[PDB]
């Protein structure tokens, strides 16, 4: 039966003044950017993974923790908290996957200006050129001994 502060609004280093009254070891926040700028990126990763669980747990829905850990490990791959939209797909290696997602003409224009190479290992890029996708039954090849 502990007592908990709850503020509508965020200033993480403001609460560091009051380290003798508040348990700042267990500070939590909704803003993943505030946690990413105060406690690092590996803390913001656990904030993402906990926030998606808190979204689904209002409705009695339990998504397994391994899915959330993979999604947060992807969105925090580059040291920053990146969105899953057409501005985070600019970092992608494959121009064809960027074209098949959104604004195909802008990514086509960037790939033509930069002279971009596609290694054809994305699942979208293997299906544009009619090649068997690398995941699943395509990570390997079969050889016939002579």
């Amino acid at each position: 039966k502990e007592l908990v502060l709850n503020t509508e609004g965020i200033n993480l280093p403001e609460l560091f003044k009051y380290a003798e009254v508040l348990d700042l070891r267990r500070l939590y926040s909704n803003d993943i950017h505030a946690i990413a700028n105060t406690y690092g990126i590996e803390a913001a990763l656990r904030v993402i993974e906990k926030e998606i669980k808190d979204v689904f747990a209002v409705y009695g829905i339990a998504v397994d923790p391994r899915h959330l850990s993979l999604v947060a490990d992807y969105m925090c791959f580059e040291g920053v908290y990146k969105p899953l939209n057409r501005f985070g797909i600019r970092s992608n290696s494959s121009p064809l996957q960027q074209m098949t997602f959104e604004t195909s003409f802008q990514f086509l224009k960037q790939a033509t200006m930069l002279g971009s190479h596609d290694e054809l290992r994305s699942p979208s890029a293997c299906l544009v050129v009619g090649k068997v996708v690398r995941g699943g039954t395509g990570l390997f090849e079969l050889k016939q001994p002579l």
């Binding site: 009619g130 996708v133 995941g135 699943g136």
Partner: protein, 63 residues
């Protein structure tokens, strides 16, 4: 009901056409592609989306 074994193809893309009155094909769209990637069946997508829509043979200069 409708069933399409082979038939007419779109004159731009050489994929089957849509409609059951024109005796056409049904889509294997994007979410079906996604859910069949999740199975790990890659030759089954290669079937549905390359051998049974448009397998053409182009000529390239290898140089």
């Amino acid at each position: 009901f409708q069933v399409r074994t082979t038939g007419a193809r779109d004159r731009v893309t050489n994929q089957p056409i849509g409609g059951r009155n024109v005796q056409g094909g049904i889509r294997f769209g994007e979410m079906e592609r996604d859910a069949l990637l999740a199975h790990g069946t890659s030759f089954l997508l290669h079937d549905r989306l390359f051998n049974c829509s448009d397998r053409s043979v182009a000529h390239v200069c290898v140089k």
